[PDB]
Enzyme design. Structure first.
Site, PDB file in Angstrom:
ATOM      1  N   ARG A 193      85.927  48.457   5.053  1.00  0.00           N
ATOM      2  CA  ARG A 193      86.598  48.843   3.887  1.00  0.00           C
ATOM      3  C   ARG A 193      87.956  48.216   3.785  1.00  0.00           C
ATOM      4  O   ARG A 193      88.348  47.482   2.864  1.00  0.00           O
ATOM      5  CB  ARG A 193      86.952  50.348   3.953  1.00  0.00           C
ATOM      6  CG  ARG A 193      85.797  51.075   3.297  1.00  0.00           C
ATOM      7  CD  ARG A 193      86.061  51.770   2.040  1.00  0.00           C
ATOM      8  NE  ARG A 193      86.678  51.581   0.754  1.00  0.00           N
ATOM      9  CZ  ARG A 193      86.821  52.653  -0.087  1.00  0.00           C
ATOM     10  NH1 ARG A 193      86.408  53.894   0.280  1.00  0.00           N
ATOM     11  NH2 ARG A 193      87.383  52.407  -1.294  1.00  0.00           N
ATOM     12  N   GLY A 229      89.578  53.241   9.714  1.00  0.00           N
ATOM     13  CA  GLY A 229      89.178  54.551   9.606  1.00  0.00           C
ATOM     14  C   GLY A 229      89.857  55.325   8.540  1.00  0.00           C
ATOM     15  O   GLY A 229      91.005  55.900   8.822  1.00  0.00           O
ATOM     16  N   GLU A 234      81.601  51.636  20.073  1.00  0.00           N
ATOM     17  CA  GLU A 234      82.400  52.462  19.200  1.00  0.00           C
ATOM     18  C   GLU A 234      82.307  53.939  19.384  1.00  0.00           C
ATOM     19  O   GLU A 234      81.614  54.676  18.708  1.00  0.00           O
ATOM     20  CB  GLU A 234      82.133  51.965  17.791  1.00  0.00           C
ATOM     21  CG  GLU A 234      83.176  52.416  16.761  1.00  0.00           C
ATOM     22  CD  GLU A 234      82.727  52.210  15.319  1.00  0.00           C
ATOM     23  OE1 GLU A 234      81.732  51.483  15.062  1.00  0.00           O
ATOM     24  OE2 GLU A 234      83.382  52.727  14.408  1.00  0.00           O
ATOM     25  N   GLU A 264      84.166  56.461  17.996  1.00  0.00           N
ATOM     26  CA  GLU A 264      85.116  56.931  17.017  1.00  0.00           C
ATOM     27  C   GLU A 264      85.527  58.441  17.017  1.00  0.00           C
ATOM     28  O   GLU A 264      84.753  59.358  16.554  1.00  0.00           O
ATOM     29  CB  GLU A 264      84.576  56.538  15.632  1.00  0.00           C
ATOM     30  CG  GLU A 264      85.495  56.896  14.463  1.00  0.00           C
ATOM     31  CD  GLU A 264      85.326  56.314  13.095  1.00  0.00           C
ATOM     32  OE1 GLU A 264      84.485  55.507  12.746  1.00  0.00           O
ATOM     33  OE2 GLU A 264      86.115  56.659  12.209  1.00  0.00           O
ATOM     34  N   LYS A 313      85.612  49.393  20.434  1.00  0.00           N
ATOM     35  CA  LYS A 313      86.082  49.594  19.075  1.00  0.00           C
ATOM     36  C   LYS A 313      86.447  51.071  18.831  1.00  0.00           C
ATOM     37  O   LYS A 313      85.725  51.871  18.220  1.00  0.00           O
ATOM     38  CB  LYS A 313      84.987  49.164  18.112  1.00  0.00           C
ATOM     39  CG  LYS A 313      85.355  48.807  16.698  1.00  0.00           C
ATOM     40  CD  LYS A 313      84.194  49.133  15.712  1.00  0.00           C
ATOM     41  CE  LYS A 313      84.786  49.030  14.327  1.00  0.00           C
ATOM     42  NZ  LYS A 313      84.222  48.106  13.337  1.00  0.00           N
ATOM     43  N   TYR A 316      75.708  62.577   8.251  1.00  0.00           N
ATOM     44  CA  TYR A 316      74.778  61.612   7.698  1.00  0.00           C
ATOM     45  C   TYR A 316      74.866  61.504   6.143  1.00  0.00           C
ATOM     46  O   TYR A 316      75.504  60.470   5.694  1.00  0.00           O
ATOM     47  CB  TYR A 316      73.350  61.959   8.139  1.00  0.00           C
ATOM     48  CG  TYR A 316      72.404  60.812   7.753  1.00  0.00           C
ATOM     49  CD1 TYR A 316      71.867  60.866   6.459  1.00  0.00           C
ATOM     50  CD2 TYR A 316      72.069  59.739   8.590  1.00  0.00           C
ATOM     51  CE1 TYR A 316      71.020  59.860   6.006  1.00  0.00           C
ATOM     52  CE2 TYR A 316      71.202  58.737   8.145  1.00  0.00           C
ATOM     53  CZ  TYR A 316      70.674  58.786   6.841  1.00  0.00           C
ATOM     54  OH  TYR A 316      69.796  57.833   6.286  1.00  0.00           O
ATOM     55  N   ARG A 368      79.413  52.422  -2.565  1.00  0.00           N
ATOM     56  CA  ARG A 368      80.499  51.506  -2.867  1.00  0.00           C
ATOM     57  C   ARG A 368      80.218  50.817  -4.172  1.00  0.00           C
ATOM     58  O   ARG A 368      81.056  50.831  -5.071  1.00  0.00           O
ATOM     59  CB  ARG A 368      80.908  50.558  -1.696  1.00  0.00           C
ATOM     60  CG  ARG A 368      82.179  51.117  -1.033  1.00  0.00           C
ATOM     61  CD  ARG A 368      82.165  51.155   0.440  1.00  0.00           C
ATOM     62  NE  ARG A 368      81.760  52.273   1.331  1.00  0.00           N
ATOM     63  CZ  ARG A 368      81.636  52.198   2.671  1.00  0.00           C
ATOM     64  NH1 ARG A 368      81.898  51.090   3.380  1.00  0.00           N
ATOM     65  NH2 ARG A 368      81.278  53.289   3.310  1.00  0.00           N
ATOM     66  N   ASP A 370      78.407  45.642   7.509  1.00  0.00           N
ATOM     67  CA  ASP A 370      77.174  46.216   7.919  1.00  0.00           C
ATOM     68  C   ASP A 370      76.813  47.593   7.417  1.00  0.00           C
ATOM     69  O   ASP A 370      75.931  48.198   7.998  1.00  0.00           O
ATOM     70  CB  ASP A 370      77.069  46.298   9.429  1.00  0.00           C
ATOM     71  CG  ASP A 370      78.021  47.135  10.209  1.00  0.00           C
ATOM     72  OD1 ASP A 370      79.124  47.512   9.836  1.00  0.00           O
ATOM     73  OD2 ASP A 370      77.801  47.571  11.369  1.00  0.00           O
ATOM     74  N   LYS A 421      76.430  46.332  17.437  1.00  0.00           N
ATOM     75  CA  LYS A 421      77.457  47.328  17.360  1.00  0.00           C
ATOM     76  C   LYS A 421      76.770  48.685  17.282  1.00  0.00           C
ATOM     77  O   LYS A 421      75.731  48.796  16.672  1.00  0.00           O
ATOM     78  CB  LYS A 421      78.327  46.863  16.196  1.00  0.00           C
ATOM     79  CG  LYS A 421      79.279  47.809  15.436  1.00  0.00           C
ATOM     80  CD  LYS A 421      78.452  48.660  14.458  1.00  0.00           C
ATOM     81  CE  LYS A 421      79.131  49.950  14.167  1.00  0.00           C
ATOM     82  NZ  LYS A 421      79.573  49.855  12.718  1.00  0.00           N
ATOM     83  N   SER A 450      88.665  45.208  13.546  1.00  0.00           N
ATOM     84  CA  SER A 450      87.238  45.187  13.165  1.00  0.00           C
ATOM     85  C   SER A 450      86.961  46.152  12.008  1.00  0.00           C
ATOM     86  O   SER A 450      86.726  47.339  12.102  1.00  0.00           O
ATOM     87  CB  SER A 450      86.342  45.440  14.370  1.00  0.00           C
ATOM     88  OG  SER A 450      85.119  45.735  13.758  1.00  0.00           O
TER      89      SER A 450
HETATM   90  O1  2FP Z   1      81.960  49.030  11.402  1.00  0.00           O
HETATM   91  C1  2FP Z   1      82.590  50.208  10.620  1.00  0.00           C
HETATM   92  C2  2FP Z   1      83.946  50.165  10.154  1.00  0.00           C
HETATM   93  O2  2FP Z   1      84.728  50.658   9.199  1.00  0.00           O
HETATM   94  P1  2FP Z   1      86.408  50.750   8.959  1.00  0.00           P
HETATM   95  O3  2FP Z   1      86.987  52.303   9.327  1.00  0.00           O
HETATM   96  O4  2FP Z   1      87.303  49.743   9.990  1.00  0.00           O
HETATM   97  O5  2FP Z   1      86.948  50.257   7.458  1.00  0.00           O
HETATM   98  C3  2FP Z   1      81.822  51.558  10.707  1.00  0.00           C
HETATM   99  O6  2FP Z   1      82.599  52.076  11.990  1.00  0.00           O
HETATM  100  C4  2FP Z   1      80.325  51.988  10.555  1.00  0.00           C
HETATM  101  O7  2FP Z   1      80.508  53.470  10.453  1.00  0.00           O
HETATM  102  C5  2FP Z   1      79.331  52.031   9.283  1.00  0.00           C
HETATM  103  O8  2FP Z   1      79.768  50.960   8.065  1.00  0.00           O
HETATM  104  C6  2FP Z   1      78.895  53.539   8.885  1.00  0.00           C
HETATM  105  O9  2FP Z   1      77.414  53.636   8.977  1.00  0.00           O
HETATM  106  P2  2FP Z   1      76.746  52.879   7.610  1.00  0.00           P
HETATM  107  O10 2FP Z   1      77.870  53.066   6.302  1.00  0.00           O
HETATM  108  O11 2FP Z   1      76.226  51.371   7.307  1.00  0.00           O
HETATM  109  O12 2FP Z   1      75.304  53.759   7.350  1.00  0.00           O
END
Ligand code: 2FP
Ligand code: 2FP
Ligand code: 2FP
Ligand code: 2FP
EC number: 4.1.2.13
Lengths: 363, 363, 363, 363
Positions: D303, D272, D187, D189, D229, D363, D42, D33, D146, D300
Site C-alpha cells: 500500500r 502497516g 513475517e 506481524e 519482515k 480473514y 482496492r 501480492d 513470503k 517491503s
Molecule cells: O506484503 C504485505 C504488506 O503490506 P504493507 O503494510 O507494507 O503496505 C502484507 O504483509 C500481506 O498481508 C497481504 O497483501 C495480506 O494478505 P492478502 O491482502 O493478499 O490476502
C-alpha cells in the site's frame, strides 16, 4: 505478555556503563579467581605451600605489575578471599585494581553438581542468598560477577535437559545480579574434552547459545548490561584432524553471528586449555576475520595470562620482577590480539606454548 | 532421547514404599514445620514467649498425644530444629514419631525470593548443597522432605516465567531428594488471595500442574516415589459468589484428573486458609465425588490440625490434656474425611470454624 | 494465564458422549481406512485388481458381517472414499455402521513429510482447511477422526524437534476437530522397526506421551473428548532378546500410568506388526495386569482384524461367508481381550499367527 | 544434539546470494501480492471492476515503469496469478522483473485461521504440499517466498500459545522453502490496532522475535538465507500520546538489536497502515539512528508504494504515465530512505499523507 519492568532507566544506565568499560577497545579481563583448591593445584607445580600469604602474594604480583598493563586490563575477576586482601602498601586489592583503571569483579558461583539421569552432565549452584551477596560485593567495590556452567560433547551429550537447566540457572543468576547493580559475565562453557571435530563443536555452540539467549529473554535480562564468556569453537583435544587458525576463527565468529544479539556489549573469550600463544593467535584471527562483528571480541583469561609468570616466580620472592615481565608480555600480547593487531612472528615462547589443559574431571 | 538411568530398581523400591505408607488408607500428614518466625506469630496469639523450650513443648504436645492418632497420621513434617529435639522421656521426636507408626519428614526449602520483572511473583531457593542435607536427614530418620512454591492469581499473574521457574525448581529439588532415598512432597501452591472465582482457580490449577508434570518428566523424576501437595480449587477469599462444597469437590477432582498421572502415589491437600471444619468437609466431599480418583486423596494440614489445640493450650502446662483432645478430634475428623466417611452433623466447632487465613504478604 | 473458553458445556458434552460409546466395555474400533495405495498393496497379496468396486466390496464384506460383531465394534475408521459408498442394499456405509450400533470415523490426515535436518524423521500434514473438512464429515455422519504421526527409535532419534513438532501438530488437529463436534483419535506412533529392547521402547513412549499431553494442554484441548492411540511398548522387530507377554503388558501399562491423565476416555491400541493372535494375547495381558488402569484399554486394529479374512476372500465373491467368519473370529477375540477375558488355549491360528509387519519406509 | 545437515554448502550458497541481492544497498521489495479479494477492495476505491485483465493491467503498470526504479527494487512479491501473466509485449512478468534487475517472489501462505481458546488470535495455514509448490515456483522463476503471521496487542494477547504457534509455523515454512532453493521472507506481524503505546509495542516485538529466532534454530533454519519482515515499533492507532520519529526509530532499532542475530541478511519493513510519507520518514530515521545496525534496514511495502499511483490511474488506461510517475516517486523516496539519505523538506504529498490503515478484522 506484560511488563512490570525489571530495571529503571537509571539502573539500565549504570549497567551498560560498567559493561562498556570492561571491554573498551584494547581491554580484556584478567581471570584471577581460582578457588583455593585450584590455586593450590597450581602452586604445587612450583613446589610452594598453598597458604594465605602465598596466595596473597601471588595475586599481589599479578595486580601491581607496572602501568604498561593499565590500558590492557578492563577488569579482574577475583575470588571472595582476594576481595578482602591488602597489598603490602596496606591498600586492599579492589583499590589497587581501581587505581590502575580496571573494574573489580567477584565469582559468585558455588560449583557444579551432577544432574541425575545424565551421562555425567552437571548444573551449577550458588543462587541461595545470592542477592544478599550481590548487595555486599557492590558495597565492597565489585561491579561485575561471574558464574560458570559446563556443557560436554559426548555421544549422547549435551542432553536437552543439560542445555535447558544450564541456560536457566544462567538467567536466574543474571537477573539477581542486575538488580544489585552488577554486570553478570555469562559463562556457558562447552568443554574441549573429547574427540569431536571443529564442526560438531560449532553445532553444539550454536544450539547452546540459542538456549541461553532465549532463557535470558524469558527471565527479562537487560542484555546491554551483560557480557558473554564462551568457548571458542575448536576441535576436541583428542581430535585427529588438524585445523588452521582462520578456520577456528570462522567457526567461532559464525557461530557467534548466528546466535548472539547485537545488544550484548562484548564477548570475552575463555582460554580453555590453549596455551599462552595458542590463545592469543586464536583471539587475533577472530578479530582479523572479515565478517561483521557487532560486539567487542576480547579475552577473559586465567591460565593463559598466568602460566609463564607462575613458572617464573617459582615461589621465590626474589623473582617478582621477572614474573611481572612475564604477565605483562601476555597482557600486551592479548591487547594486541583483541584488536587484531597481534604479530607474533619472532617474539618468544617457552612456557608460553606449553598446553594448559587439565582433566575436566568434574568438581 | 537416551537413558542413563537416575535410579536403581533397589532405589525405585525404597521410594515407592515410603510413599505408600505415608498415604495409606485413612492416613494423612501432620505439617508441623513452621519456621521459628511463623511459629512465633502463632505463639503470640496465646501470649506465650517464642523460645526453644516452648517450641519444644508445643511440638511435644502434638507428637505424643494418645494412640487414637496412630492409624490417622502417616507422617509428620518437621522443621530442622524439632528434628533434633527430645521429648521429656529423653527420646528424640523422630523416634517418638516412628514408634506411633508414622514416617518422619523435614522441610528443606529456604523460602521464596522475588522474580524481577514480575508483578510480585516469587520462586523459591534451597538447592545449594541440598544433597548434603538430604544425605544427613536420611541418616537422622527423615524419609521424606517438603519444598514449597507459591503462585498467585492476579490480573497478569501467574506469569509464564513464574509457572516455568516454579515448575523447574520443584523438579531439581525432586531429583536431588530421590538420589538420597527421600520422597519429595511437591508443593506448587496457588494462593487463595484475590477475588477470583471457582473457575479461574480451576483454570490456573490446570495450567500449573501441567507445567509441573512436564518439568518432572524432563528432570527424570520417578513419580511413584513422589506425592503432590496442591491447593484445592476454591474461589478466592475476596469472592462474592458463594460455591457449594460439592462444587469445590468437582472443581478439584476434575482439575486433578486432567493433569496428575495415575503413577503418582497420593495427593496430600493443603488447608490454605480454611478452618478446621471447612478443610475436613472439603476433604470429605473430594472423596465422595463420583469420578474415578486413581490416587490417594488425603490431608497435609498444619493450621488446620492445630488451631483449636493452640487456643486450648494457651501456653499453660496444666492444659496438655485438653489440647491433645483437641488435636485428636481433628486427626480423627480428617482420617474420616480422607475416606469419605466424615459426618459432622452435630459434632462441635468453636475455634474449629474460625478462619485461619493470613496475608500472603511474601516472606 | 487466561480463559476465553474453547468449548461450551454443550459442546463438552457431545464430545465425551461420542468418546464413551466408542470404547464402551467390550468394544473396540475397526481401522478400515487404508488409502488407495495401501489397500492396493494388500489386494495384490490375493492377486485381485485394485479398483473401486473391489475396494467397495471388500469394505462391504467387513461392515455387514453378522450381529455377533455388534457388541464388539464401537467404531470404524473409514477412508474418505468409503465414506461416500453404498452397500448393495443401496444404503451407504455410514448408515450400515450406525445401524449395527457403531460410530463412524474418518481419517483426515494427509501423510507424513520429511523434517529437514533430521536422520529421517517426519511430521505430518493435513491442517490446511481441516476445519472445513471437519464440518462436512460431521454433516455426513462421521463423529470421530484420526490423525497419524510417526516417531522412530534410532541412534539419534526421535530428535527433540521430532518430538516437539509431532506433538504440536497432534494438538492443532485436536483443537480444530473439537470445534466441529468430532472426537480426535490421537496417534503418536513410535515405530517398531530397529533392534531396540523393551526398555528403550518404554523410555521413548514415556518421553513422547509426556510431550503430547503438554502440547494438548497448551492448545486447550478437552481431554475427555479425546482418545489416545499409541504403540504398545514392545522390543524392536530386530531384537535378540525375547520378552514375555506379561512383561510387554507391564512395560505398557507402566508407561501409560506415568503419562496419560485419568480424564482421557480410553486408549485404543495399534497392532503395529503383530499378527492376529500376537495382538489379542498382548491386548489381553494388558487388561490382566494388576496395576490400576483408569481408562478403557482397547483395540484399534486394521491388519490385525483383517489378515485372515483377506487371505480367505482371495477376491472370489463366492467366499464372502468364509471371510466374515474370519473377521468375526478376530472381533470376538479382541472383545474378549479388551476385557481380559480372552483364552486362546486351543482355538485356531493359520494366517492368524503370520506376522503383518512391513517396511516403515516412509510415504 | 546431533547434525544430519539440512543443507549442503552448495545450497547454503545459492541461498545467501538470493538473499544479498534482494536487499543490496539502496534496494527494497515491492509487495504486489494482494489476493484477489484484497485487490478487489482496492480497485473499488477508483470504481473499476475487479476482473483479470484489470488486475493484469494494474500489475503491468507497476512492473514496467521506467528504469529509474531499477536500482530501487531488489524484488517483487507476486500473488500466484500474476506469476503466470504476461505484459502486452507478450513476455511474462517474471521475465519483466528479472530484466529490470529484480528477484521474483511469490506468496505461499493460505491465510489465517482462528486458534480456539483464544481472545481472537490466529495462526496461519499453507504447509500442506508446500514443498511441491516451492519446487514448481522455483522452476517458474520465483527465488523467494513470503508467509504472513499476525499477532495482536490486547489485554490478554498475544497469548503464549499464539506466540508459540506462530513462531513454529514460520519455521516449518522456512525449512521447506530452504530445501527448494527459495529464500523465505519471515513475517511475524504485530498488528498496529489498539491503544497501546510505544513501549508496549516494543515489549511485544521483543518477546515475539525472540520466540521466532528460537523456533528457527530449533527447526535448523539457515539464517543468512532468510530475511525478517516485521512491524516497526509504533504506538497503536488509537493511542493518545504522540511520539516523534526518532523515538519510533529508537524503539525499533533497539528491539531489533536485542533479538535479531547478525547472520540474518536484512530486515525488510512492513508499512502497516502508515501512509506513503509516514513510512518513508520512519524508514529514514531508522537508518539515521546512531546505533550499530548489523543488517540491511529496508522496505517491503505494498500500500505504501501504491496509494498514489492507484488514485492516479483511476482505472483509465489514458493515465498510465501519470500513475508510474507516482509509483516511481515513492520507489525513489524509499531507496533514499533505506540509505538514510531521504529528505522530504518540500517535496509533495497529496494521497501520500493519507492513512492506509484498515480493519484488521481477520480473514
Ligand atoms: O506484503 C504485505 C504488506 O503490506 P504493507 O503494510 O507494507 O503496505 C502484507 O504483509 C500481506 O498481508 C497481504 O497483501 C495480506 O494478505 P492478502 O491482502 O493478499 O490476502
Ligand atoms: O574464569 C576461568 C577461566 O579460565 P581459562 O580457560 O580462560 O584459562 C574459569 O572459566 C573458572 O572455571 C574457574 O578458575 C574454575 O573454578 P575454580 O578453579 O576457582 O574452583
Ligand atoms: O506445610 C504447610 C501447610 O499449611 P496449611 O495451608 O495446610 O494449614 C505450608 O504449606 C508451609 O507454607 C509453611 O508452614 C510456610 O513456611 P514457614 O511458616 O515454616 O516459614
Ligand atoms: O489405523 C492404522 C492401524 O493399523 P494396525 O498397526 O493396528 O494393524 C494406521 O495406524 C494408519 O497408518 C494407516 O492405515 C496408514 O496410512 P494409509 O495405509 O491409509 O495411507
Amino acid at each position: 505478555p506484560y511488563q512490570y519492568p525489571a530495571l529503571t532507566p537509571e539502573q539500565k544506565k549504570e549497567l551498560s556503563d560498567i559493561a562498556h568499560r570492561i571491554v573498551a577497545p584494547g581491554k580484556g579481563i584478567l581471570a584471577a579467581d581460582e578457588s583455593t583448591g585450584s590455586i593450590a593445584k597450581r602452586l604445587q607445580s612450583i613446589g610452594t605451600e598453598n597458604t594465605e600469604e602465598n596466595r596473597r602474594f601471588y595475586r599481589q604480583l599479578l595486580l601491581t605489575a607496572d602501568d604498561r598493563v593499565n590500558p590492557c586490563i578492563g577488569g579482574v575477576i577475583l575470588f571472595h578471599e582476594t576481595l578482602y586482601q591488602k597489598a603490602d602498601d596496606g591498600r586492599p586489592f579492589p583499590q589497587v585494581i581501581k587505581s590502575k583503571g580496571g573494574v573489580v569483579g567477584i565469582k559468585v558461583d558455588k560449583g557444579v553438581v551432577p544432574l541425575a539421569g545424565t551421562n555425567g552432565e552437571t548444573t551449577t549452584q550458588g543462587l541461595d542468598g545470592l542477592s544478599e551477596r550481590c548487595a555486599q560485593y557492590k558495597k565492597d567495590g565489585a561491579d561485575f560477577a561471574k558464574w560458570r556452567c559446563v556443557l560436554k560433547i559426548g555421544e549422547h551429550t549435551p542432553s536437552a535437559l543439560a542445555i535447558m537447566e544450564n541456560a536457566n540457572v544462567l538467567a536466574r543468576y543474571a537477573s539477581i545480579c542486575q538488580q544489585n547493580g552488577i554486570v553478570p559475565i555469562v559463562e556457558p562453557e562447552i568443554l574441549p574434552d573429547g574427540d569431536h571435530d571443529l564442526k560438531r563443536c560449532q553445532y553444539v555452540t550454536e544450539k547452546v547459545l540459542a538456549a541461553v539467549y532465549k532463557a535470558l529473554s524469558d527471565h527479562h535480562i537487560y542484555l546491554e548490561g551483560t557480557l558473554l564468556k564462551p568457548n571458542m569453537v575448536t576441535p576436541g583435544h583428542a581430535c585427529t584432524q588438524k585445523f588452521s587458525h582462520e578456520e577456528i576463527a570462522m567457526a567461532t565468529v559464525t557461530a557467534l553471528r548466528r546466535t548472539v544479539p547485537p545488544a550484548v556489549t562484548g564477548i570475552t573469550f575463555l582460554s580453555g586449555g590453549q596455551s599462552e600463544e595458542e590463545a592469543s593467535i586464536n583471539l587475533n584471527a577472530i578479530n582479523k576475520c572479515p565478517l561483521l562483528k557487532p560486539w567487542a571480541l576480547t579475552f577473559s583469561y586465567g591460565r593463559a595470562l598466568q602460566a609463564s609468570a607462575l613458572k617464573a616466580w617459582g615461589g621465590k620472592k626474589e623473582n617478582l620482577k621477572a614474573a611481572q615481565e612475564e604477565y605483562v608480555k601476555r597482557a600486551l600480547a592479548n591487547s594486541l590480539a583483541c584488536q587484531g593487531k597481534y604479530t607474533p612472528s619472532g617474539q618468544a615462547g617457552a612456557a608460553a606454548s606449553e598446553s594448559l589443559f587439565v582433566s575436566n574431571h568434574a568438581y
